Amino acid sequence: ANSATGTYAGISKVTFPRWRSIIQGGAVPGTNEALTIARMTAMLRARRTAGVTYKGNQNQRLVILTSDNIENDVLRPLYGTVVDNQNVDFTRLDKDLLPYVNYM
Amino acid sequence: ISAVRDPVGTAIADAFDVLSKKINSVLYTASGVADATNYGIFGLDAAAGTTVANSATGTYAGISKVTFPRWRSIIQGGAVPGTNEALTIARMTAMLRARRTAGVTYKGNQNQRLVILTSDNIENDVLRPLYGTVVDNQNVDFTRLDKDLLPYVNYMVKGIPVVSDIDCPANKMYLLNLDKLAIYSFDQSDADQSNGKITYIPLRYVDETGDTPSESTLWVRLADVSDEHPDLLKFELSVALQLVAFDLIDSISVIRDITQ
Amino acid sequence: TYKGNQNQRLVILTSDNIENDVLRPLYGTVVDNQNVDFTRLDKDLLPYVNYM
Amino acid sequence: TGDTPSESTLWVRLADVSDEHPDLLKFELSVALQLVAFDLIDSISVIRDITQ
Amino acid sequence: TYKGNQNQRLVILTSDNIENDVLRPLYGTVVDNQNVDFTRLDKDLLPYVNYM
Amino acid sequence: LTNLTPTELLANKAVDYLANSFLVETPMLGLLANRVINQKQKAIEWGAKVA
Amino acid sequence: QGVVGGRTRTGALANDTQGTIKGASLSVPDYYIKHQFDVGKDEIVNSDATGK
Amino acid sequence: QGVVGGRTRTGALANDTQGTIKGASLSVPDYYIKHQFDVGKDEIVNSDATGK
């Protein structure tokens, strides 16, 4: 709701829906749904449907800032869902339980 | 700003952006009446139809789909039509098979340049959970530093690319045969006076939001319709198109009721 | 002859239903892992298949 | 948290604030910033409803 | 010395009811995805093994 | 000295940037764009073996 | 964005609406992010001469 | 940490807190991990001449 009903740099978000951002909340707003992959796609398409660059390779230098309680505790188990197998070989000597990761 | 330091140039550029976007949207859906909404273009929804019934009960390019069941397209929805079933893998196989049983190219390697257009909430939220159901092993080395949580993806289907755009109607999957989906434009350039009033520069299209507008072969009349009036330029930027679907049962093939 | 090695050139014919929606899930449930690189770009959702 | 600071090109004023008071030196360190967002729909996109 | 790399040359002597009926199903659980390719022409069902 | 720099006379040098990002992806146009045929005749005629 | 609309290849030349451009204007705020400390000159020389 | 307060362009110049530096102090204990033993001086030569 705060996406509309606002203003910024002198352009009113109410009278200029292009000037709003792409904030999106849960099925019921303000209740912290689980961050399925579907809502990340939904945002990243709502980004696309607004003529806005959405893929990282679109000559535009995107970034995703996150609570770091999400990168490590929400993306890490979400990646374990988006993929089917994490394919480390058993006889690997240096098997990191929590390896360096970028979560692009 | 240089945008306001050249409003006519930016008016032309904005008109071109919205002209390309409008042509895209109408090629998706334009009932064919020559008015400001449909422009007389027959698009896809007027070529194939919208519903399974609309695949019959109509006419395209004069040929009546009613008396001629072959002129219909392969619009097939779900268990009960117009209710957005979940787009199972059996569903796309069924449509490609109903495309096969029509003697129409159903694979991308059959030498007819097929493509699939989806509402782009399908390419990202229906075909992404799919392909997690046709495979059991989406391999990733656990020690991957560049652990892309949702990687760049193209999602072919029998070699048919599933390029998507968000002006496509929702809950739909247009399987197009680009070898029978020409765009036709009436080139009346030679019937225009030699005065430099008309310039005919081509429409520009981007497939992504990060690439050069890539001038096409579609030409757009940029004609000043200026009067004797000295204080006005009064430019116009017009284009006329028909979307022909040769071999309607080969050009358009629609999956009608996708859950999202 | 009951294989392809036996020099007599067998074949199997299906309705294109069985080929595309009875042999695909079948192969899914015979091999235990269909290996796809998750970062593979041109990941055909229904790749060309011969199902021998 | 483990690399050299790599100073930014953002200049923060170390004003040598003080008074006639000779015993007291009273530096000040202040900076003024705006976080302009060209193309608000393009600049920021939020997924506000995360779970953790 | 408990590891085998400790320059002390350890060994384990089992009754072959362990190396085959115990250590084999055990190894089936210490590692999942034993991962032989399904189109292997010679699917050895008890392959030559060492079981360190 | 607020009054002595009235807003009517403070033309600040704006940054030469227009936020002209609108949906321009037209891949539907994109595919079947280089194969646009510019006829010199209004009608598009072809045959269709219906049966 | 400018609406397109259309004429009939011989219809009138009525003009349509144009895409609007608004002047976005933020300002480096009249506020600061300050930090100032009263450092007694007594506790500069004392802390210098007695600093472990 | 020295909390930062902030002020307007021309507002007040009130202070804001600093960060405490505590002198942490340990000591090598007055204690040992000691182990002492008394050999019979007889045993040293005897075992040197008798140990297998």
Short mmCIF file of N, CA, C and O in Angstrom, two decimals, chain G:
data_model
loop_
_atom_site.label_atom_id
_atom_site.label_comp_id
_atom_site.label_asym_id
_atom_site.label_seq_id
_atom_site.Cartn_x
_atom_site.Cartn_y
_atom_site.Cartn_z
N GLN G 1 3.28 7.36 -21.27
CA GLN G 1 3.68 7.15 -22.65
C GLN G 1 2.58 7.60 -23.58
O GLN G 1 1.39 7.55 -23.25
N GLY G 2 2.98 8.08 -24.76
CA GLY G 2 2.02 8.53 -25.74
C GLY G 2 1.08 7.44 -26.18
O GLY G 2 1.51 6.34 -26.53
N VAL G 3 -0.22 7.73 -26.15
CA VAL G 3 -1.19 6.83 -26.75
C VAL G 3 -0.98 6.82 -28.26
O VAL G 3 -0.50 7.80 -28.85
N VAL G 4 -1.29 5.69 -28.90
CA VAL G 4 -1.12 5.60 -30.35
C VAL G 4 -2.40 5.97 -31.09
O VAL G 4 -2.41 6.95 -31.84
N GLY G 5 -3.48 5.23 -30.90
CA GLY G 5 -4.66 5.45 -31.71
C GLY G 5 -4.39 5.25 -33.19
O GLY G 5 -3.30 4.82 -33.57
N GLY G 6 -5.35 5.56 -34.05
CA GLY G 6 -5.11 5.36 -35.46
C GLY G 6 -6.16 5.99 -36.35
O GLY G 6 -7.30 6.22 -35.94
N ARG G 7 -5.75 6.26 -37.58
CA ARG G 7 -6.62 6.75 -38.64
C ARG G 7 -6.83 5.64 -39.66
O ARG G 7 -6.37 4.51 -39.48
N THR G 8 -7.53 5.97 -40.74
CA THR G 8 -7.98 4.97 -41.70
C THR G 8 -7.34 5.14 -43.07
O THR G 8 -8.00 4.93 -44.09
N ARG G 9 -6.09 5.57 -43.12
CA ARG G 9 -5.28 5.62 -44.34
C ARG G 9 -5.81 6.68 -45.29
O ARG G 9 -5.14 7.06 -46.25
N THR G 10 -7.00 7.18 -45.00
CA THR G 10 -7.53 8.38 -45.61
C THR G 10 -8.29 9.21 -44.59
O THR G 10 -8.85 10.25 -44.95
N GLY G 11 -8.32 8.78 -43.34
CA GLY G 11 -9.08 9.46 -42.32
C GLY G 11 -8.39 10.73 -41.88
O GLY G 11 -7.29 11.06 -42.31
N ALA G 12 -9.07 11.45 -41.00
CA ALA G 12 -8.58 12.73 -40.56
C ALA G 12 -7.24 12.57 -39.84
O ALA G 12 -6.84 11.48 -39.44
N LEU G 13 -6.56 13.70 -39.68
CA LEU G 13 -5.23 13.75 -39.07
C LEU G 13 -5.30 14.28 -37.65
O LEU G 13 -4.49 15.12 -37.25
N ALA G 14 -6.30 13.86 -36.88
CA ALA G 14 -6.39 14.25 -35.48
C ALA G 14 -5.17 13.75 -34.71
O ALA G 14 -4.65 12.67 -34.98
N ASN G 15 -4.72 14.56 -33.76
CA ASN G 15 -3.53 14.24 -32.98
C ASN G 15 -3.91 13.60 -31.66
O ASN G 15 -4.99 13.84 -31.12
N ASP G 16 -3.01 12.79 -31.14
CA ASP G 16 -3.24 12.05 -29.92
C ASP G 16 -2.41 12.63 -28.78
O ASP G 16 -1.76 13.67 -28.92
N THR G 17 -2.43 11.96 -27.63
CA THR G 17 -1.73 12.41 -26.45
C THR G 17 -0.27 12.00 -26.50
O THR G 17 0.10 11.01 -27.13
N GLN G 18 0.57 12.78 -25.83
CA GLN G 18 2.00 12.53 -25.77
C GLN G 18 2.39 12.01 -24.40
O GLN G 18 1.68 12.19 -23.41
N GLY G 19 3.54 11.34 -24.35
CA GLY G 19 4.05 10.85 -23.08
C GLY G 19 4.55 12.01 -22.23
O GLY G 19 5.32 12.85 -22.70
N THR G 20 4.11 12.05 -20.98
CA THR G 20 4.49 13.13 -20.10
C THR G 20 5.86 12.88 -19.48
O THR G 20 6.30 11.74 -19.34
N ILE G 21 6.54 13.97 -19.15
CA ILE G 21 7.81 13.93 -18.44
C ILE G 21 7.69 14.85 -17.24
O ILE G 21 7.43 16.04 -17.39
N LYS G 22 7.88 14.29 -16.05
CA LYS G 22 7.85 15.08 -14.83
C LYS G 22 9.27 15.34 -14.35
O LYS G 22 10.17 14.53 -14.56
N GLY G 23 9.45 16.49 -13.72
CA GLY G 23 10.75 16.82 -13.18
C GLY G 23 10.92 16.28 -11.78
O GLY G 23 10.40 16.85 -10.82
N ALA G 24 11.64 15.17 -11.65
CA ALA G 24 11.95 14.63 -10.35
C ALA G 24 13.04 15.47 -9.71
O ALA G 24 14.02 15.84 -10.36
N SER G 25 12.88 15.80 -8.43
CA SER G 25 13.79 16.71 -7.75
C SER G 25 13.90 16.32 -6.28
O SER G 25 13.01 16.62 -5.48
N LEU G 26 15.00 15.66 -5.94
CA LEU G 26 15.39 15.52 -4.55
C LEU G 26 16.38 16.61 -4.19
O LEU G 26 16.68 17.49 -4.99
N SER G 27 16.92 16.54 -2.98
CA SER G 27 17.88 17.53 -2.54
C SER G 27 18.79 16.89 -1.51
O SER G 27 18.30 16.17 -0.63
N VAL G 28 20.09 17.14 -1.62
CA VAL G 28 21.01 16.73 -0.57
C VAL G 28 20.50 17.42 0.69
O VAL G 28 20.47 18.66 0.74
N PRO G 29 20.11 16.67 1.71
CA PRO G 29 19.25 17.24 2.74
C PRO G 29 19.96 18.30 3.54
O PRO G 29 21.18 18.39 3.59
N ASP G 30 19.15 19.14 4.17
CA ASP G 30 19.68 20.17 5.05
C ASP G 30 20.07 19.62 6.40
O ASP G 30 20.23 20.39 7.35
N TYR G 31 20.23 18.31 6.50
CA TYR G 31 20.58 17.61 7.72
C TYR G 31 21.93 16.94 7.55
O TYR G 31 22.39 16.71 6.44
N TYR G 32 22.57 16.63 8.68
CA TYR G 32 23.86 15.97 8.68
C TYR G 32 23.80 14.67 9.46
O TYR G 32 22.93 14.47 10.30
N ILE G 33 24.75 13.80 9.16
CA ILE G 33 25.03 12.63 9.99
C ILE G 33 26.32 12.99 10.72
O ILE G 33 27.42 12.73 10.23
N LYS G 34 26.20 13.59 11.89
CA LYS G 34 27.37 14.08 12.58
C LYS G 34 27.82 13.10 13.66
O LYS G 34 27.04 12.29 14.15
N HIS G 35 29.10 13.19 13.99
CA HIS G 35 29.62 12.67 15.25
C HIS G 35 30.66 13.65 15.74
O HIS G 35 31.65 13.90 15.05
N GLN G 36 30.46 14.23 16.92
CA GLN G 36 31.47 15.09 17.49
C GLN G 36 31.80 14.64 18.90
O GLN G 36 30.94 14.14 19.64
N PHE G 37 33.05 14.84 19.28
CA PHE G 37 33.54 14.42 20.58
C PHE G 37 34.27 15.58 21.24
O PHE G 37 35.13 16.20 20.62
N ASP G 38 33.90 15.87 22.48
CA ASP G 38 34.67 16.81 23.29
C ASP G 38 35.91 16.09 23.78
O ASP G 38 35.84 15.28 24.71
N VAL G 39 37.05 16.36 23.17
CA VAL G 39 38.31 15.80 23.63
C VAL G 39 39.05 16.89 24.39
O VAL G 39 39.52 17.87 23.81
N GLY G 40 39.11 16.74 25.71
CA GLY G 40 39.87 17.67 26.52
C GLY G 40 41.32 17.67 26.10
O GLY G 40 41.92 16.61 25.94
N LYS G 41 41.89 18.85 25.90
CA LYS G 41 43.32 18.90 25.61
C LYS G 41 44.13 18.37 26.78
O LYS G 41 45.25 17.90 26.57
N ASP G 42 43.57 18.41 27.99
CA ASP G 42 44.22 17.77 29.13
C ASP G 42 44.38 16.28 28.90
O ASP G 42 45.44 15.71 29.18
N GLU G 43 43.34 15.62 28.39
CA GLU G 43 43.38 14.19 28.16
C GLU G 43 43.85 13.83 26.76
O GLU G 43 43.64 12.69 26.32
N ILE G 44 44.44 14.77 26.04
CA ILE G 44 45.23 14.42 24.86
C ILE G 44 46.69 14.24 25.23
O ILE G 44 47.30 13.21 24.91
N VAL G 45 47.27 15.22 25.91
CA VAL G 45 48.67 15.13 26.30
C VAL G 45 48.86 14.08 27.39
O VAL G 45 49.85 13.34 27.39
N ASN G 46 47.93 14.01 28.34
CA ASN G 46 48.01 12.98 29.37
C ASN G 46 47.91 11.60 28.76
O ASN G 46 48.71 10.71 29.06
N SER G 47 46.93 11.40 27.88
CA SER G 47 46.77 10.11 27.24
C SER G 47 47.94 9.81 26.31
O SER G 47 48.30 8.64 26.15
N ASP G 48 48.54 10.83 25.71
CA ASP G 48 49.71 10.60 24.88
C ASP G 48 50.90 10.16 25.71
O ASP G 48 51.59 9.20 25.37
N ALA G 49 51.16 10.87 26.81
CA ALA G 49 52.34 10.58 27.61
C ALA G 49 52.19 9.32 28.44
O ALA G 49 53.21 8.74 28.84
N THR G 50 50.96 8.88 28.72
CA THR G 50 50.73 7.73 29.59
C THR G 50 49.99 6.60 28.88
O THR G 50 49.44 5.72 29.54
N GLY G 51 49.96 6.61 27.56
CA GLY G 51 49.20 5.63 26.83
C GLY G 51 49.93 4.31 26.66
O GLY G 51 50.96 4.25 25.99
N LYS G 52 49.40 3.25 27.27
CA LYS G 52 49.99 1.93 27.10
C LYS G 52 49.74 1.37 25.71
O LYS G 52 50.42 0.43 25.30
#
